[PDB]
Amino acid sequence: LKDVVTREYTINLHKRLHGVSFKKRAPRAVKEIKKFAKLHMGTDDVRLAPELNQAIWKRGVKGVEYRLRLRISRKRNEEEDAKNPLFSYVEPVLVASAKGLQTVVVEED
Amino acid sequence: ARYGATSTNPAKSASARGSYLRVSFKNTRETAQAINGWELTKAQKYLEQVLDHQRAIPFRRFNSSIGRTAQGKEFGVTKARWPAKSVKFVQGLLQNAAANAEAKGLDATKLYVSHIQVNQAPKQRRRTYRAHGRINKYESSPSHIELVVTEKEEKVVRLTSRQRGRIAAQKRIAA
Amino acid sequence: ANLRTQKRLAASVVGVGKRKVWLDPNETSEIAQANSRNAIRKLVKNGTIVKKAVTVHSKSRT
RNA sequence: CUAGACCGUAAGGUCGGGUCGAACGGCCUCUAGUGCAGAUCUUGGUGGUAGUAGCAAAUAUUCAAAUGAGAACUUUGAAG
Numbered sequence: 001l002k003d004v005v006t007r008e009y010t011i012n013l014h015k016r017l018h019g020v021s022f023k024k025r026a027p028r029a030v031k032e033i034k035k036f037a038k039l040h041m042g043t044d045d046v047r048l049a050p051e052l053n054q055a056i057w058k059r060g061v062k063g064v065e066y067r068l069r070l071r072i073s074r075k076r077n078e079e080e081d082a083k084n085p086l087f088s089y090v091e092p093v094l095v096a097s098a099k100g101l102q103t104v105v106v107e108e109d
Numbered sequence: 110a111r112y113g114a115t116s117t118n119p120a121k122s123a124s125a126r127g128s129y130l131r132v133s134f135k136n137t138r139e140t141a142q143a144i145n146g147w148e149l150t151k152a153q154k155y156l157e158q159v160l161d162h163q164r165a166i167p168f169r170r171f172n173s174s175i176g177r178t179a180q181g182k183e184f185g186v187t188k189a190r191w192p193a194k195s196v197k198f199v200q201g202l203l204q205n206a207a208a209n210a211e212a213k214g215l216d217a218t219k220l221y222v223s224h225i226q227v228n229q230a231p232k233q234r235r236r237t238y239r240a241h242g243r244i245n246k247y248e249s250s251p252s253h254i255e256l257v258v259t260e261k262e263e264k265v266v267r268l269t270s271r272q273r274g275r276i277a278a279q280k281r282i283a284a
Numbered sequence: 285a286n287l288r289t290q291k292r293l294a295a296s297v298v299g300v301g302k303r304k305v306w307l308d309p310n311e312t313s314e315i316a317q318a319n320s321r322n323a324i325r326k327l328v329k330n331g332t333i334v335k336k337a338v339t340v341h342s343k344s345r346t
Numbered sequence: 347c348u349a350g351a352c353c354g355u356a357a358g359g360u361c362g363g364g365u366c367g368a369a370c371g372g373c374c375u376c377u378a379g380u381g382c383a384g385a386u387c388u389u390g391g392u393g394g395u396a397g398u399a400g401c402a403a404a405u406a407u408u409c410a411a412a413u414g415a416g417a418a419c420u421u422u423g424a425a426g
């Protein structure tokens with residue numbers, strides 16, 4: 001289909017970080033969004049915006065938000081490309097609340 | 110020159126070596142045995158899968174108290190590992206041997222690992238510090254590695270007097 | 285690049301700690317060439333190295 | 347070095363092949379620092395154990411970029 005695409009996802013970080021030790025909730029939330037963008041875009045190479053890292057780490061290593069709105073953009077890998085030709089770039093979307101939002105495709109134009 | 114015992118055509122063979130390579134001898138031995146006899150491109154694709162943890166290296170000899178894995182079912186063993194450091198050294202030498210085969214003029218689609226042998230290099234010495242003011246050795250086990258690729262190639266009888274007489278008696282009544 | 289030396293130089297030149305020294309990540313090559321205190325001083329005035337204002341400790345609740 | 351041959355009951359002796367490169371034997375006598383499996387023997391070298399025991403105190407790391415053949419660990423920025 002369309003190998004280049006951008007979509008809005010809500011990740012339930014509450015169910016993914018449930019029962020995880022406190023000193024690695026925020027590092028594991030990093031890895032869960034990495035597995036999340038790999039499960040939705042089919043790309044091994046997942047790249048996280050530093051401002052998304054700020055949103056994960058905003059309330060410390062222990063206080064990752066229960067829900068998080070993400071913008072996952074599958075793009076074409078260049079600049080001495082790796083084994084894969086496509087990659088996922090995950091951005092945060094600034095919203096008042098991360099509740100009640102469904103998956104929606106966002107157009108590039 | 111002066112490799113191990115090889116029984117192949119030297120004119121149809123290309124070789125590669127690496128000496129004093131600081132990689133575990135035990136793990137390099139099993140990685141070498143996992144591609145011994147395979148086709149070159151099959152062996153190279155398999156080692157890439159070992160790097161990706163899709164396929165494992167069966168640990169056959171130096172394997173006591175190794176963990177078990179599902180990926181040993183491919184070879185009929187419970188104990189198999191993924192010696193990434195050993196794999197990289199081996200596939201570097203496979204890439205060098207295929208370069209020698211190309212330089213020599215050998216046809217790469219028919220190549221296969223005919224001989225691969227990992228030997229113990231001289232060990233590198235370090236110390237470790239134990240309880241009650243004791244010092245013990247802390248020693249590397251490097252590997253001598255050598256491999257060869259080759260193309261895939263496509264009575265006087267004595268009888269007594271009574272034995273000959275029977276054969277004579279069989280013939281003069283046979284149809 | 286190893287801009288560790290420049291961050292040490294910028295802290296001593298500006299007069300603050302290394303924790304308050306900002307080096308432009310988009311100007312790595314320019315900071316790399318600056319090996320003298322006079323060259324770090326030149327980088328301070330053209331904005332490449334800034335003073336990174338203090339973390340506030342309010343006494344409003346006090 | 348040699349699951350190749352011969353001689354001697356044996357200690358041993360002799361030969362063929364491989365490897366090697368500069369000295370070495372038979373016999374009659376002389377002489378000894380003259381024959382090793384042990385001595386928790388001496389010195390050196392190597393194993394099984396074993397890719398094992400383990401590399402768990404000092405709250406804690408994460409993201410991107412740069413450099414590089416290669417970055418969990420280098421540099422910078424952001425965050426905690």
Ligand SMILES: [Mg+2]
Binds near residue numbers: 019
């Ligand atoms: Mg629990």
Ligand SMILES: [Mg+2]
Binds near residue numbers: 173174
């Ligand atoms: Mg056991």
Ligand SMILES: [Mg+2]
Binds near residue numbers: 174
């Ligand atoms: Mg164990």
Ligand SMILES: [Mg+2]
Binds near residue numbers: 174175
């Ligand atoms: Mg085990």
Ligand SMILES: [Mg+2]
Binds near residue numbers: 237238239
């Ligand atoms: Mg110790």
Ligand SMILES: [Mg+2]
Binds near residue numbers: 367368
């Ligand atoms: Mg000579």
Ligand SMILES: [Mg+2]
Binds near residue numbers: 379
């Ligand atoms: Mg004596």
Ligand SMILES: [Mg+2]
């Ligand atoms: Mg002895």
Ligand SMILES: [Mg+2]
């Ligand atoms: Mg272990």
Ligand SMILES: [Mg+2]
Binds near residue numbers: 404
């Ligand atoms: Mg600690």
